Design a protein around this nucleic acid. Structure first.
Ligand SMILES: Nc1nc2c(ncn2[C@H]2C[C@H](O)[C@@H](COP(=O)(O)OP(=O)(O)OP(=O)(O)O)O2)c(=O)[nH]1
Ligand SMILES: [Ca+2]
Ligand SMILES: [Ca+2]
Ligand SMILES: [Ca+2]
Length: 341
DNA sequence: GTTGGATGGTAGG
DNA sequence: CTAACGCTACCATCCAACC
């Protein structure tokens, strides 16, 4: 088969610039103000202008504003952005029907039936790039491979604003060359676990017995790599099924007091149930971010579905349960619904 | 023991 | 208040209850 992974470039920022052309060419940091103090927040993302100075997603604003104070600091609007993503998705659905929407800014089409070889595959790659450009004035990165995984690595190499194929000549090359941290699904804990065993490339994993591999990075991780390294990896594109919908929010100051904490919780619950839409969940989870940034979960499942009124009375139970079993304060709190019908 | 739950980890550049 | 927002998938661990 043939997969055509597609990730939009510096998404949220590039939407702001589509809506505000004067921003083009300047640094633009899309932010997430928590309003605990002035400019308490986080950078959601920043255009490649601003990245050159090291303002990258995840860092604090106040720190970003050091690095670049004169850059254009816009606030995150998730709803403006989804609408776009949604519009762009329905263009991608012109080309293939089999489309998997991995994230807010990326998808895999299975263009197997639509093309006979990479040449054509790529040519469609250029076609997508252009329509999205003419229709939505956004620039994307196309990545093409025989499977999902190499599709992704392809477009890691490619981005920004680039198309990039990985034929077999290649795949088999990278299996004995590409360093193992570049394999998606392989973070840092895995990075260390693997270096310990002297495993730096996919090729290393069929010169080592399965059974140790399992007892060091887990079974599920092992088999996958082994598969990839044998190049027998066939894990097909298939429609998303949102398995959970959550929301967690930040408090003006940290707290242990239920009266202090409740109004925030209830906001997330309202916002969560609205996200849900038609879906009915079997399980709730109150989630806490502690003062020193541990993440603390408490949940329950029900045999039957969870009404909104159930969710309110229940969340508070769990929140007390949290307050009980850990003595720390709370920076953020929220809920996460799961196990739909 | 054999699942399906409860809690946490790792990763998503 | 003094830095760390926001979102989801999936796997591993401990463990409690039916074959
Ligand atoms: N709130 C928040 N949003 C994020 C975070 N990371 C990513 N996002 C949102 C904003 C991004 O524009 C979008 C997609 O992220 P990507 O991984 O694809 O990178 P991005 O789109 O910013 O540009 P990319 O080509 O890497 O350069 O998702 C994060 O840490 N926090
Ligand atoms: Ca992107
Ligand atoms: Ca992405
Ligand atoms: Ca990695």
């Amino acid at each position: 088969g043939i997969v055509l992974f597609v990730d939009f470039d510096y998404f949220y920022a590039q939407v702001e610039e589509v809506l505000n052309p004067s921003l083009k060419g300047k640094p633009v940091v899309v932010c997430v103000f928590s309003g605990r103090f002035e400019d308490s927040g986080a950078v959601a993302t920043a255009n490649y202008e601003a990245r050159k100075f090291g303002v990258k997603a995840g860092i604090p604003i106040v720190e970003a504003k050091k690095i670049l104070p004169n850059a254009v600091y816009l606030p995150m609007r998730k709803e403006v952005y989804q609408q776009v993503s949604s519009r762009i998705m329905n263009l991608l659905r012109e080309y293939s029907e089999k489309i998997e929407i991995a994230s807010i800014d990326e998808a895999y089409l299975d263009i197997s039936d639509k093309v006979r070889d990479y040449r054509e595959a790529y040519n469609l790659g250029l076609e997508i790039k252009n329509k999205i450009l003419e229709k939505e004035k956004i620039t994307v990165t196309v990545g093409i491979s025989k499977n999902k995984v190499f599709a992704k690595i392809a477009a890691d190499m490619a981005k920004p604003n680039g198309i990039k194929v990985i034929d077999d000549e290649e795949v088999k090359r990278l299996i004995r060359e590409l360093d193992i941290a570049d394999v998606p699904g392989i973070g840092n804990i895995t990075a260390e676990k693997l270096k310990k065993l002297g495993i730096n490339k996919l090729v290393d994993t069929l010169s080592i017995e399965f059974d140790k591999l399992k007892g060091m990075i887990g079974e599920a991780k092992a088999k996958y790599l082994i598969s990839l390294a044998r190049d027998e990896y066939n894990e097909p594109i298939r429609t998303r099924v949102r398995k959970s919908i959550g929301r967690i929010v930040t408090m003006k100051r940290n707290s242990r007091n239920l009266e202090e904490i409740k109004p925030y919780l209830f906001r997330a619950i309202e916002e969560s149930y609205y996200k849900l839409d038609k879906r009915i969940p079997k399980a709730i989870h109150v989630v806490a971010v502690t003062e020193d940034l541990d993440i603390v979960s408490r949940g329950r499942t029900f045999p039957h579905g969870i009404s909104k009124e159930t969710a309110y009375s229940e969340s508070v139970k769990l929140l007390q349960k949290i307050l009980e079993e850990d003595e720390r304060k709370i920076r953020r709190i929220g809920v996460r619904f799961s196990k739909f019908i």
